[PDB]
Design a protein around this nucleic acid. Structure first.
Ligand SMILES: [Zn+2]
Lengths: 137, 58, 77, 97, 141, 38
RNA sequence: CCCCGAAAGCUAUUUAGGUAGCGCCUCGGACGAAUACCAUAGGGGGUAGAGCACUGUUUCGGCACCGAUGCAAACUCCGAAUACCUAUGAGUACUAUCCGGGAGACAGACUGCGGGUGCUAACGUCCGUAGUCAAGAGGAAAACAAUCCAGACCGCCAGCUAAGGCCCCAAAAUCAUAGUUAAGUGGGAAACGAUGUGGGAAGGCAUAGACAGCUAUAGUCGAGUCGGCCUGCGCGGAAGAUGUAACGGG
């Protein structure tokens, strides 16, 4: 599970997820890529599982570029505990996802095999996705 | 001086305070009441601020 | 358990008191600031706590001047 | 010669966020043409025709003629704004050639 | 000055309607109108001013879609677990008068006046009726 | 019969049909490929 | 009988369901536009957004450094709309200010918006901001304080409208035009599966005979067909105990 090596603060506010991903929506490290189309959260375990699924089916014959990092800590209260007495304890890390954000790029693999790998990976994610290819403009 | 007619077409019970004051400053006191007002930017400002509940005849 | 946080200081009410275009008399405080966010110009005095005040009757004005880009506040008689 | 895009004048009343959204609903893409010796010109192009041009690779490295009325403007594609999610074109810049 | 109709002055007239090939609900609405008396200028809510209606060929009424197989009639005996169910085809085969009575009473007012009003509808399966002595007139509705 | 939510064609001997509003997959040779959606 | 008409906040308290000062109500007196709405003119900002130039963190390449790439309540090279202060002015409104007599109140609730906490749970809890109830009837939502329309001085067997509606229960179109749906969908429930149907922009193939079958790549057969994308409506996914009971009913 990817996690930051160090951080300034252990716990962060909940916040809100709105708007679009104007940055990071372009293919820059490969020819074919998978792109989210609805907003949500993506966890470290989901990142690893999708990466494993893609790598297995591509047979480790090309490069996989991961452009999502779970930098946001999330807390949870113990269990059988009443409200109050301070914020809960960090339990896992996530990455906020806005529509149009690219998740995985594939380089050096046949287009059909890459599309099939992305189709396998999409079954593990909690949001809709599509496939995009590099374009001049 | 050119002039215009303003008619109130909705209730002001639950509107905002400044919108109520705009109606009062125009002189509209109830639904259906029609008032005659000089056409100046000062009055047009209140009319535009309360456009959604008034009708203007020019 | 128990949280080890839960403390804060009382408010201080810092900020600007007189804006540009306003008339002031000698002694009126114009800006309350922890540091030198604004610098005194003509007819404006600086206190030990960096408070800016008027030293003459007139009208307040704000400007940007100098090589450092320092913001200045002055009074025009 | 290969790329001849039809266009229409886009006046002031057709500019702004609301007018742009109305045009895109009507299936039109606003675009701007700028270059030396002449002032900027705002035009509106058809989405189908722009997409068909986009599929071609040479369209990015060749000159193209935009026709509005009897006027003809010879230009080259400079910028292309795309919807981050759907990827549909939304706006275009054209440098006079 | 606005006067109410007098029950002693009300005149009930007799009409006969054939239901072959007609739609149940659209016939029932008209039947309810005429039974209540909404078609007479002397209409009064608290007084019965309607007309006697005789339905013939009741078994030939029709419904659209798959309601012949899908429309469900329920009744409950107040004993535990006593819910009985049937469908339109079986019911129209067995007791079509029940079909018409349900349809009309569902639209008629609920109370003593409604109970009295629904008594002026006579439903018969065959093409014949026993009320020749009343000399009904043919009504196309 | 395999009763399941997602019904697909496995081999080239399979056919997808609608019967009385029910999706069914029927295979000519292999009888185990019989699926129904539900 | 007539007139006006709150609050459930801040500060302090062996204080937390008490009390006191201020804030909010009422009455009297002294004053008079000195007040408010809007327009115009001047003025500060560091939030929304955006960004990597500081702080921290993140990925890929080439020699602690360089190029590209991404993130932040306690980061900032930037940066609104609103809100706030002052000045001049038209119109419409008895406004603003001071002194004094009398209080009540200091357990609030729901809803929309910006947020902490919680599980982006609770008719949950804690702030800021606006409406309503509290202290407010009437019409609509089946019944339904906090939703929508609307503010009840008294009487009328008079007329026009708002929200919402016009087949019957039950007032008003079984109104008019052009389409869609076959599921009673309308009138509960997602990832996902398939293609029922309407529309849209493209693409492949054909009487030198395309497409499915069938007889020895050929040919009797013959004028359309093969496959993908977007889009409107619709199908399955769909199990609980009292009696149809997930259109108020027909
Ligand atoms: Zn099979």
């Amino acid at each position: 599970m990817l996690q930051p090596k160090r951080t300034k603060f252990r716990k962060v506010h909940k916040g809100r997820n709105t708007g679009l991903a104007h940055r990071g929506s372009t293919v820059s490290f490969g020819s074919i890529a998978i792109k989210a189309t609805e907003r949500g959260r993506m966890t470290a375990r989901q990142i690893e599982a999708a990466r494993r699924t893609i790598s297995r089916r591509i047979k480790r014959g090309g490069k996989i570029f991961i452009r999502v990092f779970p930098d946001k800590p999330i807390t949870e209260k113990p269990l059988e505990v009443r409200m109050g007495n301070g914020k809960g304890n960090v339990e896992y890390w996530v990455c906020e996802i806005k529509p149009g954000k690219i998740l995985y790029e594939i380089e050096g693999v046949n287009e059909d095999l890459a599309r099939e790998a992305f189709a396998l990976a999409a079954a593990k994610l909690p949001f809709k996705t599509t496939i995009v290819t590099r374009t001049v403009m | 001086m050119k002039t215009i007619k303003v008619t109130q077409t909705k209730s002001s019970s639950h509107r905002l305070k400044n919108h109520k004051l705009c109606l009062q400053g125009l002189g509209l006191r109830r639904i259906g009441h029609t008032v005659e007002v000089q056409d100046t930017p000062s009055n047009r400002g209140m009319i535009n601020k309360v456009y959604y509940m008034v009708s203007v005849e020019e | 358990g128990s949280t080890k946080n839960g403390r804060d200081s009382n408010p201080k009410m810092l900020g600007v008191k007189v804006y540009g275009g306003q008339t002031v008399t000698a002694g009126n405080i114009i800006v309350r600031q922890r540091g030198t966010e604004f610098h005194a110009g003509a007819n404006v005095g600086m206190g030990r706590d960096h408070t800016l005040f008027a030293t003459a009757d007139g009208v307040v004005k704000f400007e940007v001047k100098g090589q450092f880009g320092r913001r200045y506040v002055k009074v025009e008689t | 010669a290969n790329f001849v895009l039809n266009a229409q004048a886009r006046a002031e009343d057709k500019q702004g966020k609301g007018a742009s959204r109305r045009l895109r609903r009507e299936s039109l893409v606003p675009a701007i043409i700028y270059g030396g010796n002449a002032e900027p010109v705002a035009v509106t192009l058809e989405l189908r025709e722009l997409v068909k041009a986009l599929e071609s690779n040479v369209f990015f490295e060749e000159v193209v003629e935009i026709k509005v009325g009897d006027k003809v403007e010879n230009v080259k594609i400079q910028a292309l704004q795309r919807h981050p999610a759907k990827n549909t074109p939304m706006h275009a810049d054209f440098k006079r050639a | 000055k606005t006067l109410s109709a007098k029950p002693a002055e009300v005149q009930h007239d007799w009409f006969v309607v054939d239901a072959t090939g007609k739609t149940l609900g659209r016939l029932a609405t008209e039947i309810a109108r005429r039974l209540r008396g909404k078609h007479k200028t002397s209409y009064t809510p608290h007084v019965d001013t309607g007309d006697y209606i005789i339905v013939i060929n009741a078994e030939q009424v029709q419904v659209t879609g798959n309601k012949a197989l899908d429309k469900k009639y329920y009744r409950h005996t107040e004993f535990p677990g006593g819910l009985k169910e049937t469908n339109f085809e079986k019911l129209v085969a067995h007791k079509p008068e029940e079909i018409f009575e349900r349809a009309v009473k569902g639209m008629l007012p609920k109370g003593p006046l409604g109970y009295a009003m629904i008594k002026k509808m006579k439903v018969y399966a065959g093409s014949e009726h026993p009320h020749a002595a009343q000399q009904p007139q043919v009504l196309d509705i | 019969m395999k009763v399941q939510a997602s019904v697909k064609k496995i081999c080239g001997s399979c056919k997808v049909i609608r019967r009385n509003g029910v999706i069914r997959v029927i295979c000519s040779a292999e009888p185990r490929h019989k699926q129904r959606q539900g």
